[PDB]
Design a protein around this ligand. Structure first.
Ligand SMILES: [Mg+2]
Ligand SMILES: [Zn+2]
Ligand SMILES: [Zn+2]
Ligand SMILES: [Zn+2]
Lengths: 145, 562, 191, 104, 99, 83, 568, 93
């Protein structure tokens, strides 16, 4: 049961959502669990002697949180409609800007449409840079919105 | 919430034997036995706290509560008590241990009887990767012999000699064994000290003999605490861990065993409940301990206390090993003997799902079969688990039930903790609701794997596995060809039948111990299962050169043969 | 939300020898780490993938296949500056209960560290600011500064008996947050 | 039956209880008051040992994140402690098996 | 029990044990001697080799290192009798698997 | 603890009587725990007889791990062990 | 009833089963150095001799570098003695001991700096006190202190001119001896390397025999060992140089380590002065403080000249060692002093006029009066060899002094009747159950209660009287015995255990308030604790701090009874 | 094989075993038990007698080998997948 290491490769909040979408689309369906028929498999303990409680719950909560609108403003889901190429085309600017910090993941899912949001995302943004590169990044990140 | 619960399959790798320190004896114990009482009239013979029969160390019947685990006798694992002893005692099991521990250290400074370079080389040899029990005992014998040979302690030479025991149960060391035609300042001290008493009494003149350095429990124990740690390896006790100290081998705390170890038997002789030997002995030990505890403060006559202190060294002997002159049953008698602990319970014991009756012959059985009475097949069951392959059969057996022989006696549901006795409950429903996890304890049927054993068991063919064949009469029947391995002769001989209860054991039995797999004896390779007397004579009379047969007789013979 | 590499031993029943082995292994791992939190690691959402699968072994008495497996499991792990829009569901006068949509809601934020003006009153008056505030069950922005995993759990059998006769640190993964920087507290303060 | 072996000067009610007190207690006279000298002695004990803890001779060791934050970038350090190898020592005062841990 | 009147079982003695060992039937040895005579699901602490109860080491008072395993009740009895004489037969465990 | 490669295996290429008995017992236990079978039952309901049929068809999916006294082992699938 | 869980929580019975010697050393090293060092030192206590390989094997730390760094740190702390035993048939290796006296510095530290401060002649000026306190703390903490580093670190020329002047004073007094193999090698190994070479160089066919060659080998070993132990115990060869156009100075490249034997002599003389302060009025007792102050600087050994630890004394003609010891004490005139010589050190504040009454001013006929009265006092403080000049003996002073201390410790722990009974057993050898009443005449119940209470220890040994061929103490009488050596064993271990417990409890308190103590030992927190610390936490901190102040006082008070028992 | 002719007696069997439980189950139970407790013997459980006493599987016959069930899981399914963030961030550094 020993944890080989504590922190593995970081996850952006789009790969997790596509994975949970894949999980729901591959099994433990919610649309069909909303229809009567627990017997189903009839192998002795329900559908093919198995059931999935305590995983469906959390795999529904995580996808619900990511599927509520991105809270830039108090219309789309926020993460669903972007694709792998919609994230790949951002390379030539993501590596254009400099931060010297893994805080890429903070801005790839939340806090658009405000300077102060990034002013909390990167501590001392103004001291490091507050000259011109404080609006173009905002326009880029809100481009999905 | 719901932090992850993890389980790992583990096997016993080994045993670390040691003596429990004083701390560990209290730590394992859950209640303190201090009173000599178990039942009181004022409590209507209901055991309460701090008594010998304290329920907090276990219960003697299913009607009670442990109050440590709140479980009945059926499910309580047993819990330990402890005894506080004033004026501690020696230990009978480690008497020679304490002796040899004393032969290594001078009793004046409590330092080992070796130079600070004498046996450090043998110690360096003692950590060699090549050591066994023989080599270990040999090196320990060497250091013991050397420290016995040595007379002067390097720290303070006090002429150690023999530390033998009395001819009693006390240990005596000759302080002045090897001193003669010589002078010592300790010797002038001794002479003057005996002048102080030879001038005060008119009768000790003859008795000034002997009176060497006697070693009591208290003297040896307080001397043991003086010993440092760097020499315990030489004394042979690993001092890395607590209780590796040599003072733990001295009885200072008595642990009171769980009452499960010393059960109280209901309804013996009188309606009042009776107790057992170990409990009575420990009650005596507690009573003496409390007496001495009070006598520390009232100043009992120093002679009587020594008499009592010698008793406490005697009650524990019986409590540990009833060797000294006598029915008292100690722990060393529960372990020792044919019907003791090891040879009576641990490798060799009574088993379930077994049977025994008279054997009879049956020449129509296959040599690899045994005819089993339907009467014992209806009690000897096999616990068949329901699969997709045998569900219909097990439902039919459930419907037949415990009385029709192709039936079943018990049903253990997949997700329940106890079996449903099939004598009641409308077996017709249970068969319908039978699931894939259920165990049906169904009757022994044709082709079941049984072990067949005739005692005494000389060779391994004294037990063989046969396929069960259910038959009407009350005897186990075997084909006579397999009488030779069993050495059985149908004159009232009885044999034992064992039904293996697991798939693995069943397969092992029929594939390794099966009759067809054991037609030869392993001692020579010669066949041992073969024709016996009347079979030999019939074969001889058929093949005899004067035997001729027409077609009708020949074909009738062949039909008999098949 | 980051991964983690774990090593485990998975007991595969003979019931499950018919389904594909990867599916069976991940089903058992999900059973073990569905909503459960690892001690002093985090909360396991589910199993991401499988890394090392050894030949399954059998003990002489079970019949099941025990597989030594190494896998990556998705766990929630804020470190020092991660953003999360809380959806609280309870408020006491000792610190609001920063809650999520059923994931885990047993985290508090200390008042001394909270906004200085932000104060509680016994008669349930929400906030005083030197002119705007927030109410219960809305969107809250905060930070992360220190993680503590409740890992003290001794219980005597008699203690358990008395406790369940009568019937706390509910989690082992408690969070906490800061509200020192302007803009934290609501999804929309201006515009 | 081991209940009549009672000496004469011994009462009958004080037996059986046993249960020696949890810890035998005798107030030693080594728990006296404090003076200026005793206070100063405690203070000098406080400075000592603490001095070696704050020194290099600790040998007792057994927020650890994967990334150096921008706040950690260009930041003051905890302490440049003087290491075990840092301080010069006497070479001819150790066995030859230990010299390798020196930065000679 | 030992009595035909008390519905006793048939003893499998040391010589029958020798025969079964000579066959090399290990699982049958386990089934006849432990499983079908006296199988006890004890709780064993992995720090102190001392049997506990209810998953409680009652010497470490932890419930952390308590392993659950099956041993002959005669073996459990022997350990509890050894602890009585102060002898501590501490059990050292190890994972069956992990190669 | 090291696995000897299938190329160089020193132990017997023959299933021993003990290996056969253990394989049958393990496979029958698995079957009694509702494990799928890979032979045509033809009315058989007993796990040991099913497992004997599977062994006769060489269809038992188990591997013998033969530990040498030095600690190394080699793996022999039941199919390849000749009877 | 006290619960077994209630026990072992505040009772502390788990520690009661430890050997006291291991407990105290382990706890000192734990609370001062750290945890890995504590594990190493405890393993050293358990196994007297072992190699770095065996430490790697025996402790959880297998990291060969880690055990090495802890060992070099512990060796610096003088907690480890080492050596090299020469394997001839392969690679020769080494073995490490544990040095007992290397931790007594960590135990005596408060008394160490107290002696260093107080015993000096000039102490009115404040700056010298702080200076010598910081220097003694630096030396006892770091270990082998190098003036090459020290002068380099010192910043002012006017200040470097006096620190060099304090080192010579400590070297000459005996608080600074050049450190070498003699502090890092075991006595028995020294003797076994000095005891076989003499057996290798002897010729063959010598007209002597085994007994004669052995006696002369022992003589040769004793001579060379005594010489080479005298050479570094006290010398001027550290400071015997004298640079041109400058002052006498110790060598700048060598190291300096602070001794402890001189401080032990100071502590023992302090105990004697306190004994006088209780027994003899201060009018003539103020002389004894200086009477021993001026003789301790060259005082002889206290337990063993180190030839009684690495080898056996003797079996026949076993009086030789104490014979030669008392003979040397008599022969050496450094310890003998006259009334004229004692005059130049006595301060004026001691009047030495009213300290006598010849019937019912710094004068020799009066100080010699105190000399003679000390010699003729019942406790042989001094013995008279010549009329006019005497000497203080240690041949027959230590036994009676230690017995007095043992008796009064037992009497302080117990009652006056217990003291009476122990004194009866002492001053009457081989007491009996009737000689007690003959020599005591105290009520039997009380005397036998005290008897039973005193039996538990090693004070009184009891003999079983055999009357028939079987040995039984249940039919006959049984008389008593002293066997005092066990009694001295016992008071060492109990006191060592109690000091171990005190260190254990302070380490527990540190464990319970580590955050608070770390906050306290911070640069900004030091000196500013009233405004910063809020009243409740400040109350908790002040109460725990006064608790540790009190417990340090307790430990120091107990630090005046066990070292005296440590002597032989 | 131990180098000396050892009997099959209670003395000859004390050759190299250190098997306190095997010696107990043969003969002379309490002496062997207290001896093993006193010297703190740490015997491994390897004898078939000890295996039987403890309910363990003996290492003889059907217990002298291991049975292993192959996963039949390839190397093309144990490949980590859908990982870009790590390299993307590293090249963003
Ligand atoms: Mg017959
Ligand atoms: Zn219980
Ligand atoms: Zn001695
Ligand atoms: Zn434990």
């Amino acid at each position: 049961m020993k944890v080989l290491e504590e922190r593995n490769a970081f996850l952006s909040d789009y790969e997790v959502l596509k994975f949970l979408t894949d999980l729901e689309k591959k099994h433990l369906w919610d649309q069909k669990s909303l229809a009567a028929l627990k017997k189903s498999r009839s192998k002795g303990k329900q559908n093919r002697p198995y059931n999935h409680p305590e995983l469906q719950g959390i795999t529904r909560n995580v996808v619900n949180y990511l599927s509520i609108n991105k809270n830039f403003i108090n219309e789309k889901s926020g993460i669903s409609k972007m694709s792998d190429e919609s994230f790949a085309e951002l390379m030539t600017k993501l590596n254009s800007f400099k931060l010297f910090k893994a805080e890429k993941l903070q801005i790839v899912n939340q806090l658009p449409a405000n300077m102060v949001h990034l002013y909390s995302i990167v501590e001392e943004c103004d001291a490091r840079f507050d000259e011109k590169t404080i609006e173009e990044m905002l326009e880029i990140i809100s481009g999905y919105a | 919430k719901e932090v992850v619960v993890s389980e790992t399959p583990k096997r016993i790798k080994g045993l670390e034997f040691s003596a429990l320190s004083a701390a560990d004896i209290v730590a394992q114990s859950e209640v303190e036995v201090s009173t000599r009482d178990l039942f009181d009239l004022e409590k209507d013979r209901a055991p309460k706290a701090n008594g010998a029969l304290d329920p907090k160390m276990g219960v003697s019947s299913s009607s009670l509560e442990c109050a440590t685990c709140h479980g009945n006798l059926a499910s309580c694992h047993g819990h330990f008590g402890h005894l506080k002893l004033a004026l501690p005692v020696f230990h009978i099991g480690y008497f020679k241990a304490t002796i040899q521990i004393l032969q290594g250290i001078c009793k004046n400074c409590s330092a080992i009887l070796l130079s600070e370079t004498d046996k450090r080389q043998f110690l360096h040899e003692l950590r060699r990767p090549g050591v066994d029990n023989l080599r270990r005992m040999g090196i320990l014998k060497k250091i013991l012999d050397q420290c016995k040979k040595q007379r002067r302690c390097l720290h303070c030479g006090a002429l150690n000699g023999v530390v033998k025991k009395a001819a009693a149960l006390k240990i005596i060391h000759d302080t002045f064994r090897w001193v003669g035609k010589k002078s010592a300042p300790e010797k002038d001290i001794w002479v003057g000290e005996w002048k102080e008493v030879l001038a005060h009494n008119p009768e000790l003149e003859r008795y000034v003999k002997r009176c060497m350095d006697d070693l009591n429990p208290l003297k040896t124990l307080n001397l043991f605490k003086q010993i440092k740690s760097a020499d315990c390896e030489l004394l042979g006790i690993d001092a890395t861990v607590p209780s590796g100290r040599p003072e733990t081998y001295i009885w200072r705390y008595l642990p009171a065993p769980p009452v499960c170890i010393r059960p109280s038997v209901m309804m013996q002789d009188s309606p009042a409940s009776n107790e057992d030997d170990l409990t009575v002995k420990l009650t005596e030990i507690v009573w003496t301990s409390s007496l001495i505890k009070a006598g520390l403060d009232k100043g009992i006559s120093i002679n009587n206390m020594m008499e009592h202190w010698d008793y406490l060294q005697l009650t524990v002997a019986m409590y540990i090993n009833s060797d000294s002159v006598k029915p008292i049953r100690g722990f060393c008698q529960r372990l020792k003997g044919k019907q003791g602990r090891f040879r009576g319970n641990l490798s060799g014991k009574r088993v379930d799902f077994s049977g025994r009756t008279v054997i009879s012959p049956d020449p129509n059985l296959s040599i690899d079969e045994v005819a089993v009475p339907d009467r014992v097949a209806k009690v000897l069951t096999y616990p068949e688990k329901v699969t997709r392959y045998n569900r219909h059969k097990l439902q039919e057996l459930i419907v037949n039930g415990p009385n029709v022989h192709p039936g079943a006696n018990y049903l253990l549901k997949r997700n329940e903790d106890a079996r449903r006795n099939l004598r009641y409950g409308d077996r017709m429903k249970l068969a319908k609701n039978l699931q894939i996890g259920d165990v049906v304890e169904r009757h022994l049927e044709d082709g079941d794997v049984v072990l067949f054993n005739r005692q005494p068991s000389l060779h391994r063919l004294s037990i063989l596995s046969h396929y069960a064949k259910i038959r009407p009469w009350r005897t186990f029947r075997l084909n006579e060809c397999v009488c030779t391995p069993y050495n059985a002769d149908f004159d009232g001989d009885e044999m034992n039948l064992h039904v293996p209860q697991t798939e693995e054991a069943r397969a092992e039995a029929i594939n390794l111990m099966g009759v067809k797999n054991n037609l030869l004896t392993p001692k020579s390779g010669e066949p041992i299962i073969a024709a016996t007397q009347d079979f030999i004579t019939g074969s001889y009379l058929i093949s005899h050169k004067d035997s001729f047969y027409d077609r009708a007789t020949l074909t009738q013979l062949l039909s008999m043969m098949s | 939300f980051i991964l983690s590499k774990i090593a485990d031993l998975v007991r595969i029943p003979p019931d499950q020898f018919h389904r594909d082995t990867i599916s069976a292994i991940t089903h058992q791992l999900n059973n073990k780490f569905a909503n459960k939190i690892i001690p002093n690691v985090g909360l396991c959402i589910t199993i991401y993938d499988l890394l090392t699968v050894e030949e399954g072994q059998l003990k002489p008495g079970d019949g099941s296949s025990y597989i030594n497996v190494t896998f990556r499991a998705v766990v929630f792990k804020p470190f020092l500056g991660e953003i999360v829009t809380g959806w609280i569901s309870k408020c006491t006068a000792e610190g609001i209960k920063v809650s999520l949509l059923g994931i885990f809601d047993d985290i508090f934020i200390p008042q001394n560290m909270l906004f200085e003006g932000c104060y509680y009153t016994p008669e349930e008056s929400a906030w005083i600011w030197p002119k705007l505030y927030f109410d219960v069950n809305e969107k809250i922005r905060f930070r992360i500064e220190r993680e503590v995993f409740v890992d003290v759990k001794p219980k005597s059998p008699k203690e358990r008996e008395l406790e369940e006769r009568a019937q706390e640190k509910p989690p082992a993964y408690a969070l906490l947050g800061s509200c020192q920087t302007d803009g934290m507290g609501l999804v929309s303060w201006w515009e | 039956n081991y209940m009549s072996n009672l000496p004469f000067g011994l009462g009958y009610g004080d037996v059986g209880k046993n249960h020696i007190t949890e810890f035998p207690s005798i107030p030693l006279p080594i728990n006296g008051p404090i003076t200026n000298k005793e206070r100063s002695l405690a203070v000098k004990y406080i400075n000592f040992g603490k001095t070696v803890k704050d020194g290099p001779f600790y040998t007792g060791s057994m927020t650890n994140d994967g990334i150096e934050r921008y706040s950690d970038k260009y930041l003051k350090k905890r302490k440049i402690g003087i290491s075990i190898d840092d301080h010069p020592y006497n070479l001819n005062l150790f066995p030859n098996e230990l010299y390798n841990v020196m930065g000679i | 029990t030992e009595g035909r009147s008390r519905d006793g079982g048939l003893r499998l003695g040391e010589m029958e044990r020798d025969c079964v060992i000579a066959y090399g039937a290990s699982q049958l040895l386990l089934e006849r001697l432990m499983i079908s005579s006296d199988a006890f699901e004890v709780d064993v602490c992995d720090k102190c080799g001392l049997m506990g109860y209810s998953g409680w080491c009652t010497t470490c008072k932890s419930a952390e290192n308590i392993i659950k395993m099956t041993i002959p009740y005669a073996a459990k009895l022997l350990f509890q009798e050894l602890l009585s004489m102060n002898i501590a037969p501490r059990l050292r465990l190890e994972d069956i698997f992990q190669q | 603890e090291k696995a000897i490669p299938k190329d160089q295996r020193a132990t017997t290429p023959y299933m021993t009587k003990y290996e056969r008995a253990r394989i049958l017992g393990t496979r029958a236990l698995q079957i009694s725990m509702n494990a799928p079978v890979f032979v045509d039952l033809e009315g058989e309901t007993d796990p040991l007889r099913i497992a004997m049929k599977e062994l006769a068809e060489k269809k038992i999916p188990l591997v013998i791990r033969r530990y040498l006294p030095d600690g190394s082992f080699e793996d022999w699938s039941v199919e390849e062990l000749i009877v | 009833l006290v619960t077994p869980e209630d026990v072992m929580t505040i009772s502390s019975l788990e520690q009661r089963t430890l050997n006291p010697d291991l407990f105290l050393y382990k706890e000192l090293v734990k609370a001062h150095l750290g945890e890995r060092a504590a594990s190493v030192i405890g393993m050293l206590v358990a196994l007297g001799r072992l190699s770095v390989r065996e430490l790697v094997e025996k402790i959880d730390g297998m990291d060969v570098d880690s055990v090495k760094t802890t060992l070099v740190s512990l060796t610096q702390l003088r907690c480890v003695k080492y050596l090299q035993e020469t394997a001839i048939s392969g690679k020769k290796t080494t073995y490490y001991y544990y040095n007992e006296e290397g931790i007594h510095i960590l135990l005596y530290s408060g008394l160490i700096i107290d002696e260093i401060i107080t015993q000096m002649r000039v102490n009115d000026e404040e700056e010298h006190k702080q200076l010598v306190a910081e220097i003694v703390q630096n030396v006892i903490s770091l270990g082998s202190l190098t003036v090459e580093d020290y002068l380099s670190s010192v910043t002012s020329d006017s200040m470097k001119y006096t620190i060099s002047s304090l080192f010579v004073q400590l070297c000459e007094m005996g608080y600074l001896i050049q450190i070498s193999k003699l502090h890092y090698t075991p006595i028995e190994d020294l003797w076994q390397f000095l005891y076989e070479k003499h057996y290798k160089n002897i010729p063959r066919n010598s007209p002597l025999s085994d007994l004669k060659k052995r006696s002369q080998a022992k003589m040769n070993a004793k001579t060379d060992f005594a010489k080479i132990i005298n050479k570094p115990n006290e010398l001027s060869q550290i400071l015997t140089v004298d640079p041109k156009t400058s002052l006498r100075i110790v060598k700048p490249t060598v190291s300096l380590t602070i001794n402890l034997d001189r401080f032990m002599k100071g502590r023992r003389s302090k105990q004697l002065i306190n004994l006088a302060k209780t027994r003899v009025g201060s009018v003539t007792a103020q002389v004894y403080k200086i009477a021993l102050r001026l003789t301790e600087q060259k005082s002889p050994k206290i337990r063993d000249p180190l030839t009684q630890t690495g080898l056996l004394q003797d079996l026949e003609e076993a009086k030789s060692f104490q014979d030669e010891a008392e003979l040397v004490e008599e022969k050496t005139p450094g310890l003998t002093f006259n009334a004229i010589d004692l005059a130049r050190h006595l301060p004026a504040e001691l009047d030495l006029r009213g300290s006598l009454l010849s019937r019912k001013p710094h004068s020799a006929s009066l100080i010699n009066s105190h000399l003679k009265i000390l010699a003729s006092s019942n406790f042989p403080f001094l013995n008279e060899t010549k009329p006019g000049v005497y000497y203080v003996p240690y041949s027959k002073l230590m036994p009676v002094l230690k017995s007095s201390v043992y008796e009064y410790v037992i009497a302080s722990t117990l009652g006056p009747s217990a003291m009476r009974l122990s004194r009866c057993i002492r001053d009457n050898k081989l007491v009996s159950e009737k000689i007690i009443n003959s020599t005591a005449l105290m009520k039997e119940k009380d005397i036998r209660s005290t008897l039973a209470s005193l039996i538990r220890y090693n004070s009184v040994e009891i003999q079983e009287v055999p009357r028939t061929a079987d040995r039984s103490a249940s039919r006959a009488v049984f008389l008593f015995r002293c066997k005092e050596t066990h009694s001295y064993n016992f008071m060492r271990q109990n006191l060592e255990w109690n000091m171990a417990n005190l260190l254990f409890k302070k380490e527990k308190l540190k464990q319970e308030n580590s955050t608070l103590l770390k906050k306290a030992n911070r640069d900004d927190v030091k000196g500013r604790e009233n405004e910063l610390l809020l009243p409740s936490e400040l109350n908790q901190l002040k109460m725990v701090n006064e608790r540790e102040l009190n417990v340090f006082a307790r430990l120091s008070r107990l630090l005046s009874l066990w070292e005296v028992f440590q002597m032989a | 094989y131990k180098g000396e002719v050892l009997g099959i007696t209670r003395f000859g069997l004390s050759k190299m075993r250190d098997s306190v439980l095997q010696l107990a189950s043969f003969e002379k139970t309490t002496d062997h038990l207290f001896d093993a407790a006193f010297y703190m013997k740490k015997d491994a459980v390897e004898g078939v007698s000890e295996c039987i006493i403890l309910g363990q599987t003996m290492s003889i016959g059907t217990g002298s080998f291991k049975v292993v069930k192959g996963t039949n899981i390839s190397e093309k399914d144990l490949v980590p997948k859908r990982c870009l963030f790590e390299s993307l961030s590293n090249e963003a550094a």
